[PDB]
Design a binder for this molecule. Structure first.
Ligand SMILES: [Ca+2]
Ligand SMILES: [Ca+2]
Length: 181
């Protein structure tokens, strides 16, 4: 501090050099990938072991966010989807945050299905709190991934979980859009 300013500018550079690609379901793969790009990614937002924090007050979710969506990570908190924008907000960014439903030994994102449009969440990281407002809710098949892609000149975050409870045949996608306070 403020070396947290360097970390943020690098994060924003990351988002801006981020190249559109296929984003696979978070639950397809259970292991950490092993690639040079993934290692490069591990270096972003790495001051603390927690990448960021999310609070969805109206469903009492207050959780840490970590790099990746391997099975160990999602047992520990909200996992961030490698391939999507880092959660530092800003333009032409779409950050995808992943959380279990049904783990039982931890609630995680069980109650994502109580959210509706106009509901609010906040993503804090690198000294800065981002307010998002929910403006799209949508159930979907695991392979149906198109809606996790960058939407240009928009600042979006999607919370994704499995649904329905105990069956996980689909995915629930709650998308919020950046709102200034
Ligand atoms: Ca760094
Ligand atoms: Ca995964």
């Amino acid at each position: 501090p403020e070396t947290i300013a360097k970390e943020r500018a690098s994060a924003e550079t990351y988002n801006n050099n981020l190249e559109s690609a296929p984003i696979l379901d978070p639950w397809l793969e259970s292991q950490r990938p092993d690639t040079p790009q993934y290692q490069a990614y591990l270096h972003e937002m790495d001051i603390d072991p927690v990448m960021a924090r999310i609070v969805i007050p109206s469903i009492h979710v207050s959780l840490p966010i970590y790099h990746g969506t391997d099975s160990r990570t999602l047992t520990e908190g909200v996992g961030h989807l490698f391939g999507t924008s880092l959660p530092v907000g800003g333009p032409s960014t779409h950050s995808v945050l992943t959380g279990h439903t049904g783990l039982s030994t931890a609630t995680m994102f069980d109650n994502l299905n109580q959210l509706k449009k106009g509901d609010v969440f906040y993503v804090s990281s690198l000294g800065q709190t981002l307010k998002y407002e929910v403006n799209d809710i949508t159930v979907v098949k695991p392979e149906e991934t198109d809606s996790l892609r960058k939407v240009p000149g928009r600042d979006l975050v999607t919370l994704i979980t499995c649904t329905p409870y105990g069956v996980n045949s689909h995915r629930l996608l709650v998308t919020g859009e950046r709102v200034p306070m």
